[PDB]
Design a protein around this ligand. Structure first.
Ligand SMILES: Nc1ncnc2c1ncn2[C@@H]1O[C@H](COP(=O)(O)OP(=O)(O)O)[C@@H](O)[C@H]1O
Ligand SMILES: [Ca+2]
Ligand SMILES: [Ca+2]
Ligand SMILES: [Mg+2]
Lengths: 362, 154
């Protein structure tokens, strides 16, 4: 019996089999329907986006369209992995600070619609920490939604210090779409959002000193890069390369009054007992696609240094595989019989209903 | 935020500890562990926690990950037991081994009621306490190690 591991991101499904070193299916968490007013899912929706309007059933880690989410899960099982879900214990994941009803309904659908024999819902950042070989540290997880900070001590997340920011990769894509209009380019539709997402992933970076970088960009063309669009048109981008992810550090770029990711990391550490803070500062683990910008770890190092006590030893850990760290941690834990012992069984669900998820999954 | 309405409302509770204590009862490696002063060592082998024979204690394969439980008498009572649990990560250990060693360290901590203090020991970065566990010449690093438990996705 092989367990399935599915990390349902806001942007991408990462799915596969426990014991594998990587997810075998990674595809967009999207359902497409004809732009002219039946549906397509994942890679195929992306391929035919020319005639489709694309919708993400998850926003900021919360499922907002349950019918489309069911389509995503069905596609994951039957079309991608090509498994019968009633044969496989299944590990799912979730962002922290979600409303409790999200995982209740995940549990209900998995048992009542997909008939899984057993399942568990894990907190993403905890999986990332184990993937890094640690029991103590503070995870900064940022995907296509929900940037979160989770400090963990001796294997237990510290709930009073968990922080969440509903600002992540999708917001950065949308902001790049907006600022590319200043250059006279027009990216507006859901299909165009996916093009801009690709430009962001290929060409953006975090400046070490934002104001200096802005001056460099005005002094010459040294920071410019070109990008070939699907129709063959070649565009040029300049200071947008680093203004886009600067939003992580300055959420006011999109009109949010929130603390940026450096100050939120610092605030999370400061909510923890003083005697463990040195270990958290020395073990800041980044996970998720929005932590992949070149320069982000060095900028984090600089900004946390400026906030922390002057002698504090600070280290940012940025695993090269961190787009998949949550999934990998799940693959490891789901390979352990004692972890599976905690999973909700079909009989437990039949007798207790969705409430059981809160009594078993931590 | 509203922790109480959220999926983290039951973190930090006695219920969380109870469930994890129960899970730890399902690992044969912990039966009998921590019953007397000394050092007990296990190596991760394809996700399993496997005892290391006493004659090898202090020799560690650079390709592997280990859990080392040091049971000792605390200053407060010479007839009681306290615990340091070290997980040692070889310079060449693979991600499945280090992640399992981390998770199973937490599990042994649970099994022993939370009392063990955890120490992460990467090869070349071992703490003063870890260096003090083995007699003169006792700490030795060996070439090689056991194969990863992961299947490689091409
Ligand atoms: N190299 C990169 N630079 C910046 N952002 C990236 C990069 N690679 C992926 N992303 C962004 O990361 C997000 C997807 O990452 P992922 O961790 O899978 O998110 P989720 O778990 O929310 O689906 C998207 O916003 C994507 O554009
Ligand atoms: Ca090995
Ligand atoms: Ca402990
Ligand atoms: Mg994610």
């Amino acid at each position: 019996t092989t367990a399935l591991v599915c990390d349902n991101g806001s942007g991408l499904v990462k799915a596969g089999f426990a014991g594998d070193d990587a997810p075998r299916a990674v595809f967009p968490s999207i359902v497409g329907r004809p732009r002219h007013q039946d549906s397509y899912v994942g890679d195929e929706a992306q391929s035919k986006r020319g005639i489709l309007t694309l919708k993400y059933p998850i926003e900021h880690g919360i499922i907002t369209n349950w019918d489309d989410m069911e389509k995503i899960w069905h596609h994951t099982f039957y079309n991608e992995l090509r498994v019968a879900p009633e044969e496989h214990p299944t590990l799912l994941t979730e962002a922290p600070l979600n409303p409790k009803a999200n995982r209740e309904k995940m549990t209900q659908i998995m048992f009542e619609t997909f008939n899984v024999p057993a399942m568990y819902v894990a907190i993403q950042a905890v999986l990332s920490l184990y993937a890094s070989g640690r029991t103590t540290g503070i995870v900064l997880d940022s995907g296509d939604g929900v940037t979160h900070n989770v400090p963990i001590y001796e294997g237990y997340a510290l709930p009073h210090a968990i922080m969440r920011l509903d600002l992540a990769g999708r917001d950065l894509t949308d902001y790049l779409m907006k600022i590319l209009t200043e250059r006279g380019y027009s990216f507006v539709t859901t299909a165009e959002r996916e093009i801009v997402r690709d430009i962001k992933e290929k060409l953006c970076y975090v400046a070490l000193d934002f104001e200096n970088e802005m001056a460099t960009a005005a002094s010459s063309s040294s920071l410019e890069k070109s990008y070939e669009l699907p129709d063959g048109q070649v565009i040029t981008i300049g200071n947008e390369r680093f203004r886009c992810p600067e939003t992580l550090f300055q959420p006011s770029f999109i009109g949010m009054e929130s603390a940026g990711i450096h100050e939120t990391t610092y605030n999370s550490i400061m909510k923890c007992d003083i005697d463990i803070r040195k270990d958290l500062y020395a073990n800041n683990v980044m996970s998720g696609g929005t932590t992949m910008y070149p320069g982000i770890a060095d900028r984090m190092q600089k900004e946390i240094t400026a906030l922390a006590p002057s002698t504090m030893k600070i280290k940012i850990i940025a695993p090269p595989e961190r787009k998949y760290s949550v999934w990998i941690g799940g693959s490891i834990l789901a390979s352990l019989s004692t972890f599976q012992q905690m999973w909700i069984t079909k009989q437990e669900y039949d007798e207790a209903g969705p409430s059981i998820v809160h009594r078993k999954c931590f | 935020y509203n922790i109480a309405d959220s999926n983290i409302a039951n973190l930090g509770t006695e219920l969380e500890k109870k469930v994890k204590l129960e899970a730890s009862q399902h690992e044969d490696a912990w039966k009998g562990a921590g019953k007397q002063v000394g050092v007990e060592i296990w190596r991760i082998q394809q996700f399993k926690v496997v005892p290391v024979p006493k004659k090898h204690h202090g020799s560690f394969y650079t390709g592997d990950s280990y859990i080392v439980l040091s049971t000792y008498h605390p200053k407060t009572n010479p007839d009681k037991l306290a615990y340091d649990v070290h997980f040692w990560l070889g310079a060449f250990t693979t991600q499945d081994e280090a992640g399992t060693a981390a998770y199973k360290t937490v599990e042994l901590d649970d099994y022993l009621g939370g009392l063990p203090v955890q120490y992460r020991e990467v090869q070349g970065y071992e703490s003063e306490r870890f260096l003090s566990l083995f007699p003169k010449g006792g700490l030795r690093i060996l070439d090689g190690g056991v194969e990863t438990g992961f299947h490689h996705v091409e």
